[PDB]
Design a protein around this ligand. Sequence first.
Ligand code: HEM
Ligand code: HEM
Ligand SMILES: CCCCCCCCCCCCO[C@@H]1O[C@H](CO)[C@@H](O[C@H]2O[C@H](CO)[C@@H](O)[C@H](O)[C@H]2O)[C@H](O)[C@H]1O
Ligand SMILES: CCCCCCCCCCCCO[C@@H]1O[C@H](CO)[C@@H](O[C@H]2O[C@H](CO)[C@@H](O)[C@H](O)[C@H]2O)[C@H](O)[C@H]1O
Lengths: 383, 124, 75, 61, 438, 54
Amino acid sequence: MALRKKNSLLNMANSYVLDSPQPSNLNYFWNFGSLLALCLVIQLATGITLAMHYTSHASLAFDSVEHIMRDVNFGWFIRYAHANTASFFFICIYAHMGRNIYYGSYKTPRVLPWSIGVIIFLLLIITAFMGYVLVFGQMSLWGATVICNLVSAIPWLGEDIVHFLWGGFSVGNPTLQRFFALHYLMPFVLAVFALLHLIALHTAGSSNPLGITSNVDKLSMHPYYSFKDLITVFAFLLMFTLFVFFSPDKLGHPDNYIPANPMVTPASIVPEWYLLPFYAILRAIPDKLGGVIAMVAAILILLILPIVDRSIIRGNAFKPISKLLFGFFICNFLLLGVLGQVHIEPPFIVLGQICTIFYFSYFLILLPMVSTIENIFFYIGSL
Amino acid sequence: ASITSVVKTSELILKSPLLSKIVVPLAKTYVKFSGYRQLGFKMNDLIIEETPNMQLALRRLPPTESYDRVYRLIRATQFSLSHKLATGNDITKPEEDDHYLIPYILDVEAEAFEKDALDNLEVV
Amino acid sequence: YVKKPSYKIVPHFLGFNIPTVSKWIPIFGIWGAAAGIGALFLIEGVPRTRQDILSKIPIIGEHWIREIPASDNPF
Amino acid sequence: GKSTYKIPDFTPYLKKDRNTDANRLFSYFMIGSFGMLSAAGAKATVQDFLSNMSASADVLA
Amino acid sequence: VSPKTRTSNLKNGLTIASESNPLVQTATVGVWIDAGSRNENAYNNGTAHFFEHLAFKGTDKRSQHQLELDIENMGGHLNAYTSRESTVYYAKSFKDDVPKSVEILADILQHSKLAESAIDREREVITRELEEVNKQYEEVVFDHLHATAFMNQPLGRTILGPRENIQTITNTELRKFITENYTADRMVLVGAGAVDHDALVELAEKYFSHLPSSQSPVPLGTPIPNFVGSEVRLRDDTMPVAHIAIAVEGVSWTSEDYYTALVAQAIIGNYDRAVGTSRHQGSRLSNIVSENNLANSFQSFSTSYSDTGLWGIYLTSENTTQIDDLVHFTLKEWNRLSTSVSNLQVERAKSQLKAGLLLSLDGTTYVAEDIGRQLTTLGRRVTPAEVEAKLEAVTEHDVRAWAQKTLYDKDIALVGLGPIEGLYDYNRIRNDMSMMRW
Amino acid sequence: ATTFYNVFVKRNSAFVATILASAFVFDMTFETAIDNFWDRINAGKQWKDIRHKY
Ligand code: HEM
Ligand code: HEM
Ligand SMILES: CCCCCCCCCCCCO[C@@H]1O[C@H](CO)[C@@H](O[C@H]2O[C@H](CO)[C@@H](O)[C@H](O)[C@H]2O)[C@H](O)[C@H]1O
Ligand SMILES: CCCCCCCCCCCCO[C@@H]1O[C@H](CO)[C@@H](O[C@H]2O[C@H](CO)[C@@H](O)[C@H](O)[C@H]2O)[C@H](O)[C@H]1O
């Protein structure tokens, strides 16, 4: 027996990266998983490096980031790499979630990897929010203020919990130092959950774009998907290069280059671009607590996809109506993103509410209806 | 959803003259646009099989039907990875798109649903 | 002479029926109490919990009405 | 030493009142006390430890 | 509607009980005795079973050979068995051969030779029986189960007795045993099938009239057992099938919970993969075991004695890597007798038992065994109308109450025989006797 | 004493509820008891003992 199978440690590696049996027809949208792993590795390496130069004290934090930009050898690169990869991490994670929704990766028997995935998505959001605060520019401070004030909505204990998060009566030094510690930690927790969702997946194996069993036709993970993953690694690195080297601040908010000032409030306090759809969902509900619940529900509702999809067929490759509905859902999610960054003005107020209703009605009404109808059309249609 | 549910609902529609007059033509167009026939699948090949019920139904297929199913799945997987479509004899013609599996899954489910009912019986 | 056994199917869902669930209703009650006692116990230190809940309990409630004398309080 | 139906001598260890409710209850009293002190200890540990995150003395000044 | 069981007494206190059936042509007469292994002490343990051998070894009149011939000439057969609490000696014959058979039974019980030469001969036969029961796994398991559950108590002893006693049983102690125990007030002459009651009472007055009466005549089925939660493992990796019994202290014949315990037993029920219908049984455990191939069989039992009982289940399995699951699921099904049973299960089990207790009696030997058992354990035959009423009185609430005091979180006696490596240690088995979720 | 078992111990829900309620009582009483004990062994030493001068 070959060593890679005999030795228990090697065999665990072998089972995931080498002999792992994969469907032979995975398309390029199955490459986001490895890109996300690459982002996670880049973020760990650049993040740990920034941590060697960053100072968490509010009196020094912003200046320590300037010191990294200006004084540390290649500090500019490590800083921009970390900041831009945070954006790419969300592009890739949305792509990965999009792939999973379109191809019905959330259906049995893959409910568990899907559900753990929803938690990974929440941890990524928390990680990225805390990391943004660490710069302690104007957007850092004001974003922390408004996002942490949402917890004030929790009845009875809300105010007390906010003071507890802040370690104080406003966002300041205690908040910054604790976010540093947690921002350092959270990516390791995220890595553990990412590993758990893979272990959960390994019982069923990857889905495939046809949505049929692949048990009939498997391919070793290496060399086939190893070399296929290289193509997207180099495509990713090209996109990374164009941002990091040529336009490092295209995805950034200029206000974050002004030191935090609790007195001056910036023109428009918006989250980072990847949180904007959730921000639009929050604004849609007039009630403070309602808004917070809706915003959380917009993420947690993904957990009910396994239930509300009533199709007898896995995924959308063969379902014309579901494909149209999915197209509208995705474009609406992008519109929500856009409405997250406009001013609270007519006519975007009403529009934001309509898009929010469309967002929720996809899970609660349209997907259950459309999936039921298509079941019937496949049966009657093939008689 | 259960295949039982889908089949019962479809039979309600095929009974009602009005309903069939408007639904049958739609469903035929839907299936044409669905395009699974272009990969040489029969409709039934697409049903989710990773369920205890469906594993049982597949085990009950006659050997011939079972071997042919495996071929269609392998062939379609190869078309998928090649980004090609079936041509000629590989395209499933409407007359070849037979519900080979539906009777087996309906029997498996019938017993499973009777079992659930009878587990809840109350002597009167 | 009996021609047929006499039975009904009771309404059920996900393998739960009303006869069975009704037997567990009391147990959810006790677990709810246990969760109540446990939660309240965990936040007994929170000042709002004392102010709004624990100090209002008859007899016992004076345990949580404690003032630092103004002579010993820097703040 | 040969018959397997002659149960070995357990009289040094057998409780005479082994099937009484008193007997079970006593062992559960020990388990329950241990659970009670573990709960009281955990609550104390959690409460004191997490209080580090409430405003420090310099902030409250 | 069955014919009435007629009951008469003699002067000495011998009970005669008969249930006539003018549809059949055979008759089973016999003597049920309220005496068995439990009546021995530790020194004479094995005597009762020893006597059973010698009873057929010749009497004061007929020699061993003459006895054989007399029964052969009758046409039917004689049979005997000794249990812990009951000894039976019966004779199945033709209708008009009943006077011969009662005469033969009276002879072998009262006037047996017990000749030193025959004691010595059987002493080897019985010694060889010690090394051949070893094959009858169900009995091996249940003998260890009694041994452990009633550790160092009379019920805990085997019927055969230790090797040491077999070598030292004398005709004196045999004589003393049957003189002390086989008394008229402890015996019931039973006839079922083609018997006239009045004819049987006359035969009893002819043959069993000079029976000794005991000094203190207590009623029939009058008895202190202290159950030990404990385990015996008899691991044998060469065996292909594991046999496991799990029991708790159950109910006596005269318990007020006797029918409740039967209903509970019927909720768990039996299963046998070799029977066609078993995959479709209503029992939850049956479903779990059949779907997962966890066992070859299981058999719930509720064994009763005069003052205690064992209630439990006996499992056989070839699935040696999933014995843990089998035992896990079994004990979780028992937990549900405490936590979950409702009118659904209870009414279904009552239906099954209302028939089952009558179905069992399908031949004259079974009818005689039923009359004999009931008369020696309860002092009367319980009519089917009373049985139907006692079962009807069992509610779901009664079953739950019984299980919560008898099963829930209780010590078990556990015996495993065979490839039982996968059976966890006592604690993990006993931990399944409660549910943390409840 | 069967009664006590049946009420507080038999159901785990009840047993855990009992343990947590006991922990609540213990925690409050132990706090008070140690406070008094500590003040007696450290009598005249602590601020509360000299505070009255000011
Ligand atoms: C750090 C973030 C993540 C990493 C590194 C990661 C990685 C991967 C990898 C490597 C795979 C197998 C290959 C692939 O299909 O692309 C995979 C599959 C999967 N991931 Fe993720 N993932 C992440 C986040 C998520 C999230 C947020 C979700 C869901 C909300 C998710 C749900 C899934 C599911 C359902 C599959 C199975 C899909 C299939 O093969 O059909 N993952 N992931
Ligand atoms: C999922 C992994 C991570 C994500 C998504 C993430 C995200 C971010 C983001 C969005 C920022 C704001 C960047 C800026 O605009 O300047 C940031 C800053 C920071 N992150 Fe992370 N981060 C990750 C992992 C880590 C790790 C493991 C460390 C290890 C300490 C770390 C340390 C830092 C530090 C020190 C800063 C402040 C310096 C700066 O702004 O560049 N990060 N992170
Ligand atoms: C992706 C990152 C790379 C590192 C790999 C992840 C580290 C953690 C992985 C271990 C978690 C347990 O993972 C589990 O391991 C065993 C053996 O390794 C695998 O077991 C599988 O492979 C071996 C042979 O290759 C067979 O004995 C077995 O029949 C098969 O199921 C499981 O399919 C996998 O689920
Ligand atoms: C899901 C878990 C629930 C949330 C956990 C709650 C976290 C924080 C809660 C209480 C923390 C602050 O709450 C406070 O605790 C400290 C002990 O730490 C107590 O303080 C008391 O003891 C400490 C030492 O033990 C003394 O320094 C103090 O003078 C005295 O008042 C306060 O009387 C209580 O009001």
